[PDB]
Design a protein around this ligand. Structure first.
Ligand code: HEM
Ligand code: HEM
Ligand SMILES: Cc1cc(N)nc(COC[C@@H](CN)OCc2cc(C)cc(N)n2)c1
Ligand SMILES: Cc1cc(N)nc(COC[C@@H](CN)OCc2cc(C)cc(N)n2)c1
Ligand SMILES: C[C@H](O)[C@H](O)[C@H]1CNc2nc(N)[nH]c(=O)c2N1
Ligand SMILES: C[C@H](O)[C@H](O)[C@H]1CNc2nc(N)[nH]c(=O)c2N1
Ligand SMILES: [Zn+2]
Lengths: 407, 411
């Protein structure tokens, strides 16, 4: 029942008890591990509310207090009367921070308690959503000195009046199928681009076109808005040694901002809750630049470096990969846009895991996501056993809305 | 039931049905995943079902399921078990069994090769000297002057658990490690405890950086005995770099033959506690782990220094740069000396083709993503993008306790 995790590099063993709280299911059974799979009423609501409020009142050292019992009763009466309830500001903020704290796939959680929470529960229209999001973008970007933020739109009611940001991130680049047969821009974003075009967006048909926002308020049909260009901070990619690197014409945007997830707090569902931090360099240099189905630039870089590409065993892919990742970190640092390298980030996560074990009795972590997509075993998380389990408040995946929306 | 796995780079979806044949437990539950945990005497009554399921699988594989030969063999095994408490595998069943344990090894990226395995039957072995001779022959056969051949040697199965055959070494060939009084280590820090055991048992340690350990062998539950592998049978490759002429002066070399000797082979409920097996290396096993783990030879700094990398900040990626160069050096050296090695790109590409073939012809391929993905350049290998299902099929290779923890010393 009490489980140990071992670090195989340092021999340090930690005991996990926090997993006994876990509520949701993992996808695994005693017969089969699904660790590597990417996506595996009034009655229901009150126990979920109670469980959360219990944890909240515990955190402020007022468990079993008058104010604790009074709030529980107040929420009970509210659910019985209205079929739902409203979180106090203090609760919303706690909940948001804890959803991050509980995010098993996030290496950056040492930062979890420094999150700026923007309460957009008063928003009613898509134009309002656009204004809140521009403000989030400008606040988080902070002229390159990035600050973690989440903006929280109104909670789900009957599920026919959902707030959704249709975009997967606040800032991403368009992708277009060419008559040529090749793909211009980001191949990951072809379907969503078509939805935008189909809804009226005038597409520039370039390599690095920032997508408009497609915003849905109160379950109405979504609307297009372009983020003010001057609020989207971008970084041209160059290399400290290779003068030719800039001629590849590569750039990336500074703000990673996930907008397609659902925040669950105390049984309430926040279907539009864009959140942002700052990049770990491999997210851009390994994944965005080098994935076969993304910008896929390994060959072009290898050629400019004049590597022997006739045989895999020359490790030309590996050499080019490192150089691309060097250039990403150098360009962000030179322009003073916050970024963290995978060595620094994983070292921080190990310190954070130790804090969480010491202070909370554990830290749910998904090793498959936490270990960086390059140089895995030269980072300390590679040698760290991790236990993966689901705690609430949480960020959850949810269906893409175009599959779900009735026009 | 059907389970689907998707490849996120190609959108190829595969359907697994083989998982329905899984028996043994994973460690995970519907509430916790233990997929990154490294390590998550049999009654008559339990043995006959295990024998039967294995024999059913064997007979199916030879398209003789339900035949007179199959039925007679079940009966013969049933009678042997009730009369002697155990049974003996036919040579054919043993070969099938060993090949399948490899086929079933979910942490092994090299399984495209599973059907090409030379099985040395050592069940007539009775003494440690006899084990030493079997193992020298395995090493010479497998080495094949650099043209490496996969092989396994199988010593007598467990009886009462008081007469076990064991190879105490974790691999047939490994380098000694010595903790110095000042807390530094000479040689391979992973092998310090075992080196101390070897010295206690009487080994005269050369005390250098690459001393091949002696074999420590236990026959029939007796105290283990020390033997030196003839040096002329131990193929080693000096590590040099194609462009950096200073690389050779780091004084590195590695052995050509990776041979796991500490695992237990389970076939039809029988337990072969001494079953050393060998193939050939994937380059990252040496260049990433053996050379660069902080707990192993740990050479990254010295390499980075010699390359004149900016070592003032991790964000120059000096570690990553030096890591690639070391791994180029390992592949270059093995190739230059005509010692079989495979790079991580080739190996993973071959694994994906193997896995797709298994899904189509066998209904699945249990695989442990945490182990299959190489420890460098993960996402530029096709396995990183492949969803996998991990479950346990028998026959199998299993971990077992280190024998110094369990052995009853005779004196
Ligand atoms: C401040 C710096 C941060 C860093 C360096 C960071 C790091 C990362 C990285 C590298 C990933 C994997 C991304 C991928 O491979 O696609 C990730 C995932 C994730 N992070 Fe963070 N994170 C940060 C901030 C945040 C914040 C502010 C939140 C929420 C408030 C958050 C929540 C999440 C979630 C829910 C995932 C999983 C996303 C998914 O499943 O697609 N992170 N994090
Ligand atoms: C023929 C070339 C082979 C290659 C390239 C290869 C590759 C590998 C690699 C890279 C690993 C992970 C090693 C580690 O990180 O410690 C491994 C694990 C393993 N392989 Fe293979 N393999 C080969 C042959 C074999 C053979 C012949 C067998 C047995 C008949 C086998 C059974 C296993 C087992 C049981 C593991 C898991 C070991 C453990 O848990 O420590 N492999 N393989
Ligand atoms: C908040 C945050 C900070 C940070 N450094 N990184 C992130 C993650 O970035 C967004 C991620 C969410 N999975 O999206 C990238 C992506 C793209 C594609 C095509 C698939 C996928 N799963 N993920 C989020
Ligand atoms: C047969 C075979 C072929 C091949 N290419 N590689 C292997 C595996 O190599 C041996 C491995 C077994 N995991 O041993 C390395 C090791 C060392 C230490 C200190 C711990 C550990 N778990 N593993 C085995
Ligand atoms: C199949 C596998 O789960 C998938 O490719 C994963 C692996 N690990 C990952 N790790 C991170 N951080 N991000 C990812 O998108 C993925 N993708
Ligand atoms: C804790 C973690 O499971 C451990 O460090 C693993 C990860 N993946 C691995 N993969 C391989 N091939 N070999 C290993 O030793 C490990 N070690
Ligand atoms: Zn699992």
């Amino acid at each position: 029942r009490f489980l140990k995790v071992k670090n195989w590099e340092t021999d340090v063993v930690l005991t996990d008890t926090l997993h006994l709280k876990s509520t949701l299911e993992t996808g695994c059974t005693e017969h089969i591990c699904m660790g590597s799979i990417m996506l595996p009423t009034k009655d229901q609501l009150f126990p979920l509310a109670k469980e959360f409020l219990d944890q909240y009142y515990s955190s402020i050292k007022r468990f079993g207090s008058k104010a604790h019992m009074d709030r529980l009763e107040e929420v009970n009466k509210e659910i019985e009367s209205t079929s739902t309830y409203q979180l106090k500001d203090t609760e919303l903020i706690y909940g948001a921070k804890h959803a991050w704290r509980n995010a098993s796939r996030c290496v950056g959680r040492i930062q979890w308690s420094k999150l700026q929470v923007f309460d957009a529960r008063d928003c009613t229209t898509a134009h309002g959503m656009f204004n809140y999001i521009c403000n989030h973008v400008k606040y988080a970007t902070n002229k390159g000195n990035l600050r973690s933020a989440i903006t929280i739109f109104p909670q789900r009611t009957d599920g026919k009046h959902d707030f959704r940001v249709w975009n997967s991130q606040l800032i991403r680049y368009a992708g277009y199928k060419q008559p040529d047969g090749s793909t211009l821009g980001d191949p990951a974003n072809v379907q969503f681009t078509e939805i935008c075009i189909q809804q009226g967006w005038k597409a520039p048909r370039g390599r690095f076109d920032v997508l408009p926002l497609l915003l849905q308020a109160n379950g109405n049909d979504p609307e297009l808005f372009q983020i003010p260009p001057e609020l989207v901070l971008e970084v041209p990619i160059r290399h400290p040694k290779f003068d030719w690197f800039k001629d590849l014409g590569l750039k990336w945007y500074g703000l990673p901002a996930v907008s397609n997830m659902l925040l669950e707090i105390g049984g309430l569902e926040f279907s539009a809750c864009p959140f942002s931090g700052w990049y770990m360099g491999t997210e851009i240099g390994v994944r965005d630049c080098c994935d076969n189905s993304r910008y896929n630039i390994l060959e072009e870089v290898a050629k400019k470096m004049d590597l022997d590409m006739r045989k895999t065993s020359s490790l030309w892919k590996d050499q080019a990969l490192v150089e691309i990742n060097i250039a990403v970190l150098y360009s962000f640092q030179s322009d003073k846009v916050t970024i963290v390298d995978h060595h620094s980030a994983t070292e921080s996560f190990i310190k954070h895991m130790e804090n969480e074990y010491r202070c909370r009795g554990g830290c749910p972590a998904d090793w498959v996501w936490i270990v960086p997509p390059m140089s895995g075993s030269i980072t300390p998380v590679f040698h760290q056993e991790m236990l993966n389990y689901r705690l609430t408040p949480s960020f959850e995946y949810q269906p893409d809305p175009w599959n779900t929306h009735v026009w």
